[PDB]
Amino acid sequence: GKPLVVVYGDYKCPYCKELDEKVMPKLRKNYIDNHKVEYQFVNLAFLGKDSIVGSRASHAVLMYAPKSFLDFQKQLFAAQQDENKEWLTKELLDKHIKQLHLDKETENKIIKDYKTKDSKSWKAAEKDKKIAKDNHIKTVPTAFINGEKVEDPYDYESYEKLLK
């Protein structure tokens, strides 16, 4: 079927922020938004106790407002602070969710889901760490297309090469 592009990372990882900045704009316009590939972000949530919280919110946005997901990712990476700070607080995440300007009830649904223990967004966040584990993902950021490694994950043309 459609090629599958997987990017492993963490919202607190600085290099992952670089990837988002250099790659996503082009990959999104050309392959993701026109539905040419399935895009998946697996969050290792390994840079602090707030990492997993950021991941839950991200998964709630993805499941309830998929068409706003890439904007959310881009905007959250842009607000990245020192990785030693637990900057991914509920106040910041709620602020980011509301910036998506979604309809009030979806907004509330997303905000309540990621804060609710064992919710679908809660579970998705935990599963991400297991996926990275079972796939033996050592460092981040790393990207694969149908299980094939992207030679230079910071270069759009490198993904493009695997998709041509």
Write the layout of secondary structure elements.
Elements (H helix, E strand, L loop, with lengths): L3 E6 L4 H9 L1 H9 L5 E6 L7 H14 L4 H10 L11 H10 L4 H11 L5 H15 L7 E4 L2 E2 L6 H8 L1
Parallel strand pairs: 1-2
Antiparallel strand pairs: 1-3, 3-4
CATH superfamily: Glutaredoxin
Overall strand count: 4
> Largest beta sheet: what is the strand line-up?
2-1-3-4
Rounded to the nearest angstrom, the radius of gyration is: 15 Å
Percent helix among the residues? 40-55%
Structural class: alpha+beta
Q: What composes the largest sheet?
A: 4 strands, mixed
Secondary-structure element order, as H and E? EHHEHHHHHEEH
- For the termini, the CA-CA separation is 15 Å
Beta percentage is 5-15%
The CATH topology, please? Answer: Glutaredoxin
Q: What's the overall geometry?
A: globular
- What's the CATH first level? Alpha Beta
Which architecture name does CATH use? Answer: 3-Layer(aba) Sandwich
Count up the helices. 8
Q: Work out the count of structural domains.
A: 1
Family: Belongs to the thioredoxin family. DsbA subfamily.
Protein name: Disulfide bond protein A
Keywords: Disulfide bond, Isomerase, Oxidoreductase, Redox-active center, Signal
GO molecular function: isomerase activity; oxidoreductase activity
